[PDB]
Design an enzyme around this catalytic site. Structure first.
Site, PDB file in Angstrom:
ATOM      1  N   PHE A  29       0.831  -1.200   0.000  1.00  0.00           N
ATOM      2  CA  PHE A  29       0.000   0.000   0.000  1.00  0.00           C
ATOM      3  C   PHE A  29       0.868   1.253   0.000  1.00  0.00           C
ATOM      4  O   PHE A  29       0.575   2.224   0.704  1.00  0.00           O
ATOM      5  CB  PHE A  29      -0.912  -0.001   1.223  1.00  0.00           C
ATOM      6  CG  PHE A  29      -1.714  -1.259   1.370  1.00  0.00           C
ATOM      7  CD1 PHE A  29      -1.893  -1.839   2.616  1.00  0.00           C
ATOM      8  CD2 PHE A  29      -2.293  -1.861   0.262  1.00  0.00           C
ATOM      9  CE1 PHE A  29      -2.631  -2.995   2.747  1.00  0.00           C
ATOM     10  CE2 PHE A  29      -3.030  -3.021   0.389  1.00  0.00           C
ATOM     11  CZ  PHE A  29      -3.199  -3.589   1.633  1.00  0.00           C
ATOM     12  N   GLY A  30       1.936   1.217  -0.796  1.00  0.00           N
ATOM     13  CA  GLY A  30       2.917   2.287  -0.836  1.00  0.00           C
ATOM     14  C   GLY A  30       4.348   1.769  -0.810  1.00  0.00           C
ATOM     15  O   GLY A  30       4.776   1.060  -1.720  1.00  0.00           O
ATOM     16  N   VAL A  32       7.896   0.677   2.041  1.00  0.00           N
ATOM     17  CA  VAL A  32       8.394   0.426   3.387  1.00  0.00           C
ATOM     18  C   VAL A  32       9.711   1.172   3.600  1.00  0.00           C
ATOM     19  O   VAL A  32      10.624   1.078   2.781  1.00  0.00           O
ATOM     20  CB  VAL A  32       8.576  -1.086   3.644  1.00  0.00           C
ATOM     21  CG1 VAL A  32       7.267  -1.819   3.402  1.00  0.00           C
ATOM     22  CG2 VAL A  32       9.662  -1.657   2.747  1.00  0.00           C
ATOM     23  N   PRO A  88       8.388  -2.794  14.209  1.00  0.00           N
ATOM     24  CA  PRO A  88       9.824  -2.892  14.481  1.00  0.00           C
ATOM     25  C   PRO A  88      10.596  -3.269  13.222  1.00  0.00           C
ATOM     26  O   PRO A  88      10.156  -4.118  12.456  1.00  0.00           O
ATOM     27  CB  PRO A  88       9.905  -4.042  15.480  1.00  0.00           C
ATOM     28  CG  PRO A  88       8.574  -4.048  16.156  1.00  0.00           C
ATOM     29  CD  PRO A  88       7.598  -3.676  15.084  1.00  0.00           C
ATOM     30  N   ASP A 140      -1.854 -13.207   3.061  1.00  0.00           N
ATOM     31  CA  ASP A 140      -0.607 -12.917   2.374  1.00  0.00           C
ATOM     32  C   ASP A 140       0.531 -13.757   2.917  1.00  0.00           C
ATOM     33  O   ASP A 140       1.631 -13.264   3.112  1.00  0.00           O
ATOM     34  CB  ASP A 140      -0.256 -11.437   2.492  1.00  0.00           C
ATOM     35  CG  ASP A 140       0.304 -10.866   1.179  1.00  0.00           C
ATOM     36  OD1 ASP A 140       0.396 -11.622   0.184  1.00  0.00           O
ATOM     37  OD2 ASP A 140       0.624  -9.661   1.139  1.00  0.00           O
TER      38      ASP A 140
HETATM   39  N1  LIG Z   1       9.491  -4.601   9.942  1.00  0.00           N
HETATM   40  C1  LIG Z   1      10.392  -4.863   8.867  1.00  0.00           C
HETATM   41  N2  LIG Z   1      11.703  -5.035   9.106  1.00  0.00           N
HETATM   42  C2  LIG Z   1      12.575  -5.277   8.119  1.00  0.00           C
HETATM   43  N3  LIG Z   1      12.181  -5.362   6.847  1.00  0.00           N
HETATM   44  C3  LIG Z   1      10.884  -5.197   6.533  1.00  0.00           C
HETATM   45  C4  LIG Z   1       9.953  -4.943   7.541  1.00  0.00           C
HETATM   46  N4  LIG Z   1       8.743  -4.828   6.945  1.00  0.00           N
HETATM   47  C5  LIG Z   1       8.914  -5.000   5.617  1.00  0.00           C
HETATM   48  N5  LIG Z   1      10.211  -5.231   5.357  1.00  0.00           N
HETATM   49  C6  LIG Z   1      10.807  -5.401   4.028  1.00  0.00           C
HETATM   50  O1  LIG Z   1      10.122  -4.677   3.049  1.00  0.00           O
HETATM   51  C7  LIG Z   1      10.363  -5.354   1.776  1.00  0.00           C
HETATM   52  C8  LIG Z   1       9.142  -5.393   1.050  1.00  0.00           C
HETATM   53  O2  LIG Z   1       8.216  -6.324   1.505  1.00  0.00           O
HETATM   54  P1  LIG Z   1       6.699  -6.030   1.225  1.00  0.00           P
HETATM   55  O3  LIG Z   1       6.628  -4.839   0.287  1.00  0.00           O
HETATM   56  O4  LIG Z   1       6.015  -5.669   2.528  1.00  0.00           O
HETATM   57  O5  LIG Z   1       6.014  -7.311   0.575  1.00  0.00           O
HETATM   58  P2  LIG Z   1       5.047  -7.210  -0.662  1.00  0.00           P
HETATM   59  O6  LIG Z   1       5.434  -6.122  -1.690  1.00  0.00           O
HETATM   60  O7  LIG Z   1       3.629  -6.810  -0.109  1.00  0.00           O
HETATM   61  N6  LIG Z   1       4.984  -8.677  -1.467  1.00  0.00           N
HETATM   62  P3  LIG Z   1       6.299  -9.005  -2.460  1.00  0.00           P
HETATM   63  O8  LIG Z   1       6.108  -8.336  -3.790  1.00  0.00           O
HETATM   64  O9  LIG Z   1       6.377 -10.552  -2.689  1.00  0.00           O
HETATM   65  O10 LIG Z   1       7.645  -8.507  -1.817  1.00  0.00           O
HETATM   66  C9  LIG Z   1      10.676  -6.754   2.085  1.00  0.00           C
HETATM   67  O11 LIG Z   1      11.772  -7.172   1.367  1.00  0.00           O
HETATM   68  C10 LIG Z   1      10.877  -6.813   3.541  1.00  0.00           C
HETATM   69  O12 LIG Z   1      12.098  -7.340   3.802  1.00  0.00           O
END
Ligand SMILES: Nc1ncnc2c1ncn2[C@@H]1O[C@H](COP(=O)(O)OP(=O)(O)NP(=O)(O)O)[C@@H](O)[C@H]1O
Length: 297
Positions: A29-30, A32, A88, A140
């Site tokens: 949703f944007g 990280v 975290p 997910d």
């Molecule tokens: N609390 C956290 N601590 C460390 N890394 C995080 C944390 N939350 C998300 N990430 C990282 O953010 C990156 C993106 O993951 P994420 O965007 O949330 O998955 P996604 O886009 O919804 N599905 P996908 O396309 O398969 O990666 C990942 O590689 C995670 O390692």
């Protein structure tokens, strides 16, 4: 008390005015962002950029679901503009990363760490389905969405697609999202999600942990290999040899029967029939030692 009310700015700076060299990745949703907090804590933050209200569920979750194998939300940011979620920062990143990457030449996940990962994560999911008021469907489950702490214990993260049930045991009607690799057949087929569609996802998650592969991979197509992880692996029963299927980075580790064990579990969880899939608590049991040998025909 608990649950942190944050003010955009006091987290623009924490993200160093946000963007750029702070992107851990483009989220659901944007994006990280890895920031710090006034005192010291590494956080990762979710930023939204344009129906939804998906936000308020991820916020009062905390108040219905807590568990050491579930990413605990630190806080959020409202603003009559766009909104934010702060979790975290996770020392060792996703299981995906640790398999998919790594940097410079950081080491691979040894086999017993992969066994712990499967266990904790199932524990976190079992709790979602069974010990929460409305049951919580995660939606997910995948290696990218299982995060690792400093001691490499699994925490289940990103509750973007999570749904609150009630609706007895079955069903939560809602449109199909996620990626193709982890969607249960009945789910895409029938537009309904349930605990058994989490189970399927979890069982694909395990295939990733074992193989080191993505669930849907055109590079396998680039060969005479199945695009679908599950299909590929079921190149087991036939073409003997884990060996080729088991993650090349493991060599040294695992005992044949160890992996065979996890695989049976993954296989049991990704059966096309939702009814014959284990419940996650059954999964934990089997990872725990109880009742796998006969679970199948
Ligand atoms: N609390 C956290 N601590 C460390 N890394 C995080 C944390 N939350 C998300 N990430 C990282 O953010 C990156 C993106 O993951 P994420 O965007 O949330 O998955 P996604 O886009 O919804 N599905 P996908 O396309 O398969 O990666 C990942 O590689 C995670 O390692």
């Amino acid at each position: 008390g608990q649950l942190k009310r944050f003010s955009l700015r006091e987290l623009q700076v924490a993200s160093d005015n946000f963007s750029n060299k702070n992107i851990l990745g483009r989220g659901g949703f944007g994006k990280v962002y890895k920031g710090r907090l006034a005192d010291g804590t590494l956080v990762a933050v979710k930023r939204l950029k344009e129906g939804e209200l998906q936000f308020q569920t991820e916020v009062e979750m905390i108040s219905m679901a807590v568990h050491r194998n579930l990413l605990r939300l630190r806080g959020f940011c409202m603003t009559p503009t766009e909104r934010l979620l702060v979790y975290p920062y996770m020392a060792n990143g996703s299981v995906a990363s640790c398999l998919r990457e790594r940097p410079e030449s950081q080491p691979p996940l040894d086999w017993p760490k992969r066994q712990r990962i499967a266990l904790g994560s199932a524990r976190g999911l079992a709790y979602l389905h069974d010990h929460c008021d409305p049951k919580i469907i995660h939606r997910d489950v995948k290696a990218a969405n299982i995060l690792l702490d400093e001691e490499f214990e699994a925490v289940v993260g990103d509750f973007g697609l999570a749904k609150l049930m009630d609706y007895k045991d079955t069903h939560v009607t809602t449109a199909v999202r996620g990626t193709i690799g982890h969607i249960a057949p009945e789910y895409l087929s029938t537009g309904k999600s349930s605990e058994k569609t989490d189970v399927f996802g979890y069982g694909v998650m395990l295939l990733e942990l074992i193989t080191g592969q993505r669930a849907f991979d055109l590079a396998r197509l680039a060969n005479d290999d199945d695009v679908m992880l599950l299909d590929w692996v079921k190149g087991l029963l036939k073409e003997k040899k884990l060996e080729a299927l088991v993650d090349v980075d493991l060599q040294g580790n695992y005992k044949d029967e160890e992996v065979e064990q996890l695989i049976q579990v993954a296989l049991l969880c990704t059966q096309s029939s939702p009814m014959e899939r284990p419940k996650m608590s059954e999964v934990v049991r089997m990872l725990e030692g109880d009742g796998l040998a006969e679970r199948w025909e």
